Write a protein that binds this ligand. Structure first.
Ligand SMILES: [Ca+2]
Ligand SMILES: [Ca+2]
Ligand SMILES: [Ca+2]
Ligand SMILES: [Ca+2]
Ligand SMILES: [Ca+2]
Ligand SMILES: [Ca+2]
Ligand SMILES: [Ca+2]
Ligand SMILES: [Ca+2]
Ligand SMILES: [Ca+2]
Ligand SMILES: [Ca+2]
Ligand SMILES: [K+]
Lengths: 87, 61, 86, 99, 56, 98
DNA sequence: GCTTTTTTTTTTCACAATCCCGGTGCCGAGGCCGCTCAATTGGTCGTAGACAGCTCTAGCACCGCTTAAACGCACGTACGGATTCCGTACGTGCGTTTAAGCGGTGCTAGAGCTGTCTACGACCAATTGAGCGGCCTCGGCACCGGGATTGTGAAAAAAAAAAGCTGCA
DNA sequence: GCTTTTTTTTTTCACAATCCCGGTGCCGAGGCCGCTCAATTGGTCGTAGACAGCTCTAGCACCGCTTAAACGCACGTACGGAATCCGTACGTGCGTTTAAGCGGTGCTAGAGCTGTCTACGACCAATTGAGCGGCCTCGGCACCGGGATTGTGAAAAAAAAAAGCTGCA
């Protein structure tokens, strides 16, 4: 069995209305249609850099599971220190 | 290696901080490693935003 | 407070504005607005009233527009040569 | 006759709604998939603690909400109200995230 | 001290992250101390630039 | 009779100063400022001469970089002239300012 | 049309500023030299962690049910940005004023080095109480419905700010 | 100085969203227990660093030349920014479609613990060669002057458009 992980193009699951909500919290009143894709790329770059380091922390520990500490240590390194998930 | 090349292009036997700066800031990767780092006496790379230039071309010998 | 504005009509007030500057490019909408306050009595709706008549004078053929579009430009009278003002 | 709010008024209303709250604004499973997608590209057959996926999402949304604030200042700087990608690109360039 | 006062203004007996976030982000010094720190489940301070409000 | 158009000598200076590496603030004034600012932390302080140079190097680097960021904000608002709001927005976005 | 009046474009001009190329001044890179220290060698001793083996957390798959949210389209408003115009904030350039910079001399604060001595912190072993996981309960709070309150927006009606038009200083 | 329009209020009314209360029920804050392992106590042992005393570096204060750079002022060009104007991008709201979330169940990889055993790293004392500060020499590089290239701006020619105006079909 072992159930392969199907790369489905999930970056598009980061919906337009979601991106719009994030911008409302950010205080944005009006939004160019070009925004929603720009954001996705910005988000992807963010996620890759955090997840690369995190997974590096995972690999060095000889683990098959990325822990919340891997992620925390990753965000610390990237200068984006997160409170509430340990450490 | 790179700064040595910079000094050679300058017709200069000796590497100086500017040769180290030019090396570092024209190497995409060294620039990122050393991007929150200040090289005393290096200056900056030549660069003038295009909207600040005049536009007219009529040229050199 | 000024209580009214004892003045001529606006088609004449803009026509009087262009005649007092012999400029071949033509009088602009801001140059006419600077006239009508400084040399006549006028309202506080005036600048909007200056813009509205130049749409009626362009549509009628009375006032010709040199450079520009709409009430953002510079205009002149259909015939430069007149009897006594200029 | 049917009631309609002028453009801006429901947007201003949303701003207030979301600034008052702390719920994550990206839908959880889509996010969770995306993370795993991206994680394949560096290592194959990785599991995640759900707190690791929540920690990432908390971190992302915080960064994006933050970036939108700076993006909104750049838009307003240029005498606008409408964020556009050059705003984002400027924010990130001044932030030193980008060349 | 500051988180508690925010829990009281919210008519809540228990401090939760949002109360910590309000405490920190409204205190000039604590904010500086934690200027590059993300408080999960905290949200943001209400801020709407003046220009974006109605003219009335 | 002869005179250059506005902006021409400016561009010439840009070319001049991006080509060179000399400090651009005058050294003694800079030093006087340092000493003065220092007095509000500890009286009758002395300074290694290299420590002043080290602070001037840093300042000048800081400002030159800030001006780069300031220029971009000017240009973003379809301007060629830097103004205090450009410096403020840069500094706001860098995290220096509230 | 042709002519008037701009507008644009090249040419041609003169001409500053920069760059380039050839000779002169002097300081610091580069290497040599004694020599102290810190890296090396070869030895002993103790535990860090690799490894295997076992426990049982919690991460993953799968289901089907409801309904919240995402999606797509109809509709028009208010936003962005092009164009166009005006006033002065800026950039250039000149002549006058200023004080940086340089080179030299004279004084001493205080950086920093050395040697001495002991108060203090590492290490140990034995003792025992703070803080751990596990567990249990009961009140804070999340979620709901209903009613009160607030703010937004369209259209109507009243108040006061202007239009051209009337004879005329 | 008179109607007859605007525009500028204030008003009134309908509507949708948000606020606030009590009711309800569930689950996690909170606190108690029982045991453990990490802090404590009392002891020895060695050296880190305060301390005093001395050397001499480099920080400071001063000075007077020589000029490069700062300053102040005259002058106008090109910029910033206000204002119009027009087309549609993006917000709003609705009906339809999609799949997130939910609560649950079953299966198992692999996180994380324990016990064993030994390779490797600390620690040591004796050994010695690489790298330290200090000092001398000479070659690279910085200056300088005075000649050549490179762009800019003005003025003119030309081109070329465009503007204002009309004949003639
Ligand atoms: Ca060995
Ligand atoms: Ca062990
Ligand atoms: Ca407990
Ligand atoms: Ca509950
Ligand atoms: Ca309780
Ligand atoms: Ca202005
Ligand atoms: Ca402009
Ligand atoms: Ca294992
Ligand atoms: Ca081993
Ligand atoms: Ca040496
Ligand atoms: K000293």
């Amino acid at each position: 069995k072992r159930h392969r992980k199907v790369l489905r193009d999930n970056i598009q699951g980061i919906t337009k209305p979601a991106i719009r909500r994030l911008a409302r919290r950010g205080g944005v009143k009006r939004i160019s249609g070009l925004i929603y894709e720009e954001t996705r790329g910005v988000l992807k770059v963010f996620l890759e850099n955090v997840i690369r380091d995190a997974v590096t922390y995972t690999e060095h520990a000889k683990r098959k599971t990325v822990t919340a500490m891997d992620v925390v240590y990753a965000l610390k390194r990237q200068g984006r220190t997160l409170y509430g998930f340990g450490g | 290696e790179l700064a040595g090349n910079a000094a050679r292009d300058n017709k200069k036997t000796r590497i100086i901080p500017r040769h180290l700066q030019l090396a570092i800031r024209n190497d995409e990767e060294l620039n990122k490693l050393l991007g929150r780092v200040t090289i005393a006496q290096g200056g900056v790379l030549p660069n003038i935003q295009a909207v600040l230039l005049p536009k007219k071309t009529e040229s050199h010998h | 407070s000024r209580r009214s504005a004892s003045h001529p009509t606006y088609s004449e007030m803009i026509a009087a504005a262009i005649r007092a500057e012999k400029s071949r490019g033509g009088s602009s909408r801001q140059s006419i607005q600077k006239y009508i306050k400084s040399h006549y009595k006028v309202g506080h709706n005036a600048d909007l009233q200056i813009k509205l008549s130049i749409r009626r004078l362009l549509a009628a053929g009375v006032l010709k527009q040199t450079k520009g579009v709409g009430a953002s430009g510079s205009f002149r009278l259909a015939k430069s040569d007149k009897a006594k003002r200029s | 006759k049917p009631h309609r709010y002028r453009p801006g008024t429901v947007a201003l209303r949303e701003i207030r709604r979301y600034q008052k709250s702390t719920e994550l604004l990206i839908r959880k499973l889509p996010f969770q998939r995306l993370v795993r997608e991206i994680a394949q590209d560096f290592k194959t057959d990785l599991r995640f603690q759900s707190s690791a996926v929540m920690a990432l999402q908390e971190a992302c949304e915080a960064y994006l909400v933050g970036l939108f604030e700076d993006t909104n200042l750049c838009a307003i700087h240029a005498k606008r109200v409408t964020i556009m990608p050059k705003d984002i690109q400027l924010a990130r360039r001044i932030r030193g995230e980008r060349a």
